[PDB]
Amino acid sequence: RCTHLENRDFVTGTQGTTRVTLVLELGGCVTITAEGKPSMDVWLDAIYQENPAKTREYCLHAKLCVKAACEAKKKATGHVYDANKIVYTVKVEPHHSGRKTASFTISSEKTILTMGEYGDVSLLCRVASGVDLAQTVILELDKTHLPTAWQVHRDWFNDLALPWKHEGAQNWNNAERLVEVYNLGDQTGVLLKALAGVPVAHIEGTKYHLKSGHVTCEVGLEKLKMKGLTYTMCDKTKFTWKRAPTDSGHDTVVMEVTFSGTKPCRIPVRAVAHGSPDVNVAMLITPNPTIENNGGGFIEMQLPPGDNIIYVGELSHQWFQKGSSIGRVFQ
Amino acid sequence: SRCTHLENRDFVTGTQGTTRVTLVLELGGCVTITAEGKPSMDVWLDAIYQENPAKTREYCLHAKLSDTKGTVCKVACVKAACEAKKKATGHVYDANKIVYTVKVEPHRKTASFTISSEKTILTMGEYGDVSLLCRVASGVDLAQTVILELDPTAWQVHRDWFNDLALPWKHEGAQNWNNAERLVEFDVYNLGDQTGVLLKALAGVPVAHIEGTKYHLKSGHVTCEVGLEKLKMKGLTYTMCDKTKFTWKRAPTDSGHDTVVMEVTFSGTKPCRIPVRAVAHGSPDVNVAMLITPNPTIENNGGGFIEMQLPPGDNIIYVGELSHQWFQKGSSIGRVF
Amino acid sequence: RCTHLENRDFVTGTQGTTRVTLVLELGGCVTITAEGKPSMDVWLDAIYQENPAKTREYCLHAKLSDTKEHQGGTVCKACVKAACEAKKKATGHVYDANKIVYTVKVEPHRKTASFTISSEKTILTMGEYGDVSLLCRVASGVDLAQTVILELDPTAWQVHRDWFNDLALPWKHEGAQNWNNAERLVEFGAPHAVKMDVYNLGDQTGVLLKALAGVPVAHIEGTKYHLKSGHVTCEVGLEKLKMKGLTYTMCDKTKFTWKRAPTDSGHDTVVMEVTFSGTKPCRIPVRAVAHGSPDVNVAMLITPNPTIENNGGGFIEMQLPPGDNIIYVGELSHQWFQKGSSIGRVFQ
């Protein structure tokens, strides 16, 4: 599942310093190996924020001149991320055992690790969200056998035509949106209809996970002869679709290919926008798609809106990319 | 050509034959990289855009009404709709969907990057397999931007300005307009077409360059690290241009995207590095010029264009002994509508 | 105070180019030194924006005129003209992330360079070191998109956008002739048939100050709106020079004491100071554990390389996960409770 470090991706100095550049996408692993020392696996294991700030609470079903209240367990709550509080956890392990862990944020970039056999190693990781956090709100329903947490657009959330308040307030704002005597009933159904196909938010306890993002690390090694490899290009005539291009569930395109040639090798990947077959429009999330002796074959990418053609050598598949949207209209 | 040559300081050659090259490519900025016995290659940032950004609020500039009695009420009521082609629509960028297209051509390969897509391998032919790692950087604070477009037709407006626009609004797909009474005064009178009042408020506001579906940005850069193998990289170093031989081709002016642009002519020996700085009137020791142009140079045929950011107030730009006073206006969300 | 550049942090090329990678947090200094040349101190001196854009103005105290309807700037049920009291506004300011300046200073044992998101590269003539290319990637310590500077006529705070936007007070933009939602500071009593009672809710400065308790303060130095969090990551390019390579030994874990026990920095981080009684200079062993696991290090240092120098050192800044944590500085330990995120206290 791990890609090997290539010669081009590291530099060895006259004064014995090795500078390595790793691009680690969520779930992506790179194997770094030095002479006489066991090979180490380096990967981005998680992207999350624990307990993000609660913003507006929307009422889905209004209750009760007497004050308008909300029905029991009938709220839709918003949560906002703090881009500087999101944790990117990098794990280092040989080949559990001598597994090192380092967490980074926008604010915390540098750490010195004692990689045992590789000695004191400097790790400088620049984090990069796969989500435009400024335009995101986590919409969550009250605990009751369905997805009840979504990643919605800020402009959609803020203009939700429902009564609202902040936790601690004892008065609902714009309660006349469900009340007046006129009562409009439970709007959970209308909301769920609008949230169809919208990315679900992975919450594991207090950890609010992100399913997209990477880290670009500058690794500093001292006094060691780094074993560098170079991949040959995979034969374009020996690819098959294990998994044809599909929506990842976080605004990317995922696919998996089968290789029936000599391994390991570099996967030839490109995409063309309809009309121009010369320009490559594939923007890979997978920094180096390869076929390994062990595994390999999974490719993630961004594509322009419209009709595209993905090429994995001579293997092709058309892909229609939908345009951007703040969400479906709610009334 | 405005292509700058790669300098010795901008690359490192390893013991195990690896060359690491750092390029700073601002929109329209080009760098020429050259290897021993191999032809020279031009590397530039060609475009920054997002295709079809998400539609946010639609504002009504001119109310279309029905007969007196999705309604505005006094009791007398009218049905309030919008006039044909009289909307002002908002569009939001997805920072991770903005494409930064890098082109490589001798003296042709294309690679696109986003916040999410940073790495590619490109077969540059005589240079072999080349790893390209580009960190993209918007020249616009995207979180505080809304693209306002009429049915110059488009502008880059501040989010806080857009959100508080005193006009009726709705989202694409909604039947009724919110706050329709903003264009209805009570006998029912219509406040008329507000396009004129809006155009007056949008004066001098940065225009949004829309090329079909491509919503362009005219500000931004990419910082790339280039990995080359088994090749003798040519190392060139620019001498500083003579401070006494500069003259204004185009005196400092607004770029149209919150920067200061200018052009200079050089009468001395070329090519050389342009000496550029600025001082806040009163403080003459501190350099306050923040160049958008990573390496301003005078080329044998070409060079002389300088882009920079400056602090608010009274500044004095220096291109060697050549000087020009520049007044920098402060930040604003926009004019009150 | 200044830490020394380590061997791992720089690479020397075959064609005589040295590439140094510096991480400079606000107030953090790194000493770079070359054989036969004087030492140079490199630090991030300031992070600020001059005159950020003014957004909404909120009224804290209503200036109600004459108690007597189709007019703009009145509250009705009898009608009174509603304006704001003199110097009783709470103004919002938004940063332009691309307009924030990160000033790097270089001095022996003096040159200045300013960077922004948009301006990354500059060439400096470091004198004894010759022409040095400086490429600094700036990084705000504050999520600017979710921040508003709230200032009164302590003067200013960094508040959350969602909190600011939903403030239950009358508002307007500079230049507008009338206040929106002015009825938020007007109260109407039972009518006396010939006259109706009109009350003013009074000055709300007090209620606001109570809600802004513990909220990070905005440091305004004239026109300069400062940030107290953030760093810059610089790629420093040097020519034809023998760069001195130093490597720190690890500090003895048994010789640390608390000069200052873990505390809130005032900008969403944890700060502390330790004293060292062993042989100097050395690298400080710093780690932290959270309730969730005892094996995983959860300390996210703001201080790129905490060291004990001959000339000071011992100050450590870090981010920690929410909840119960235990900070370790060798064998020296201290528990730290980290409060979770919040847009702010409910304002009435």
Question: What does it look like?
Answer:
The structure is a homotrimer. The first copy, chain A, has 331 residues and is mainly beta. Chain A has three domains: 1-50 and 82-130 and 199-229, no CATH class; 51-61 and 71-81 and 135-167, no CATH class; 230-322, no CATH class. The first copy, chain A, contains two helices and 26 strands. The first copy, chain A, has helices at 154-158, 188-194; strands spanning 2-4, 10-12, 17-25, 29-32, 40-50, 53-59, 75-80, 87-94, 100-104, 110-114, 120-129, 136-141, 149-153, 164-165, 203-204, 207-209, 213-222, 239-247, 253-259, 265-266, 269-273, 283-284, 290-291, 298-302, 306-312, 315-321. In chain A, strands 1, 4, 5, 8, 9, 15 and 16 form a seven-stranded mixed β-sheet that branches. Chain A has a five-stranded antiparallel β-sheet with strand order 2-3-17-11-10, with no helix packed on it. In chain A, strands 13-12-7-6-14 form a five-stranded antiparallel β-sheet. In chain A, a hairpin with a 5-residue loop joins β10 (110-114) and β11 (120-129). Chains in contact: A-B, A-C, B-C. At the A-C interface, β3, β6, β9, β10 and β11 of A face β2, β3, β14, β22 and β27 of C. The PDB classes it as viral protein. Keywords: envelope protein, stem, virus/viral protein, viral protein. The assembly is trimeric. The entry is titled "Post-fusion conformation of the envelope protein of tick-borne encephalitis virus with longer stem".
Topology:
3 copies of one chain form a homotrimer.
Chain A lengths: L1 E3 L5 E3 L4 E9 L3 E4 L7 E11 L2 E7 L15 E6 L6 E8 L5 E5 L5 E5 L5 E10 L6 E6 L7 E5 H5 L5 E2 L22 H7 L8 E2 L2 E3 L3 E10 L16 E9 L5 E7 L5 E2 L2 E5 L9 E2 L5 E2 L6 E5 L3 E7 L2 E7 L10
Parallel strand pairs in A: 1-4
Antiparallel strand pairs in A: 2-3, 3-17, 4-5, 5-8, 5-16, 6-7, 6-14, 7-12, 8-9, 10-11, 11-17, 12-13, 15-16, 18-19, 19-24, 20-23, 21-25, 22-24, 25-26
